Design a protein around this ligand. Structure first.
Ligand code: PRP
Ligand code: PRP
Lengths: 203, 211
């Protein structure tokens, strides 16, 4: 499965959907400094890459949530991916902003997200599905930053989450290719453990 | 011949929208939109997403309109949020890049200078969303070939804006075809036909209710 995480991570680097600048930090909209930037909306503009991703998400759904009956996407980024997955699996689709498209009582649903950072969008979306009477099998996403605050929320909501690729696999990949060195690898590992703390900047 | 092909498709699609509850016609029991206005028609195309056979027929349909009217297309743009899924299906059948426009950045996904773009919408009522979305694309330096949508109410105020913006718009189905279909099924008759025609000409005016 790590082969897949590494392949997908390579694809995100290749198209500019993920970047790594531990020595020249980004500043998210939150105001927080970060060594990573991820814009998975770019995957939409690359036909071969988005089809690989959909194939990837279909595979995760079959191994972890085989009984799925309906696919739900998160407005707005993940709607397109939910569409491609639903099509490859020949399943009904719906989306959450309320809940558009049929999502009837007791149906087994899988949520498709493009990114998990804090987990707020995923949880919000899962809540609505449960509130409408759906059994949410879990979530699949393209990528996750593996932040501890994200894991904690997913646990509090009792939601299983799997991602095509993640921060550690991207990190290992970037180092294999020489995009980053040993020093930059340590700044990256420490940012993940304490993202609120600006120590990592000079680790 | 072209004309029959085109209209057979408008009727098939209209029949599918009625069957799944994506459109309703009640000239003798009017709806009230969120805007406060009374209407003989209600349309929620988001329901198409829950019907795999119907949505594929729609995507095939939109691909066909794009090939006849805008063959040189290079990128597909969907309107947040309803039309993003349809844009996704169309982009895939055509193996083309995709982007979307909101109303984060306004234009998400690559939409580079000089690229020929086609916007995909699910519904055209007043034309405001479409025009907004088209303006952004032109402002970013894209050539907007035109727009394709699943359905349109054929309102005169809508046509006028699309002309002022010099945007060609084609729809998979429309009010008139739905109207002719609804009659074929007995959902309405010839008496209600006049209420429906007048609503289309002057939707703001509640004369149609008792036409
Ligand atoms: O785990 P979180 O901290 O919620 O971050 C993840 C969210 O960020 C992006 O959406 P965003 O709402 O920024 O905009 P969008 O409308 O482009 O999806 C993405 O679609 C995720 O839903
Ligand atoms: O031609 P117009 O008069 O703009 O109306 C057409 C639009 O109305 C709906 O907007 P809404 O924002 O309710 O839909 P959405 O958020 O579900 O995309 C829908 O998105 C259509 O694209």
């Amino acid at each position: 499965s790590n082969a897949m995480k590494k392949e997908i991570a390579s694809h995100l680097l290749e198209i500019g959907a993920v970047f790594l600048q531990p020595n020249d930090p980004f500043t998210w909209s939150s105001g927080m400094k970060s060594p990573i930037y991820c814009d998975n909306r770019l995957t939409l503009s690359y036909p071969k890459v988005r089809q690989t991703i959909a194939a990837g998400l279909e595979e995760l759904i079959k191994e972890h949530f085989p009984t799925v009956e309906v696919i739900a996407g998160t407005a707005t980024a993940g709607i397109a991916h939910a569409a491609w997955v639903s099509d490859r699996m020949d399943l009904p689709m719906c989306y959450v902003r309320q809940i558009e498209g049929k999502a009837e009582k007791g149906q087994k649903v899988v949520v498709v997200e493009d990114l998990i950072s804090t987990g707020g969008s995923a949880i919000t979306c899962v809540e609505a599905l449960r509130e409408a009477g759906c059994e949410v099998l879990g979530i699949v996403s393209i990528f996750t930053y593996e932040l501890e605050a994200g894991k904690e929320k997913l646990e509090a909501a009792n939601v299983a989450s799997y991602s095509l690729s993640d921060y550690s696999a991207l990190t290992e990949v970037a180092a294999e290719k020489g995009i980053i060195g040993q020093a930059e690898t340590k700044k990256l590992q420490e940012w993940r453990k304490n993202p609120a703390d600006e120590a990592w900047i000079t680790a």
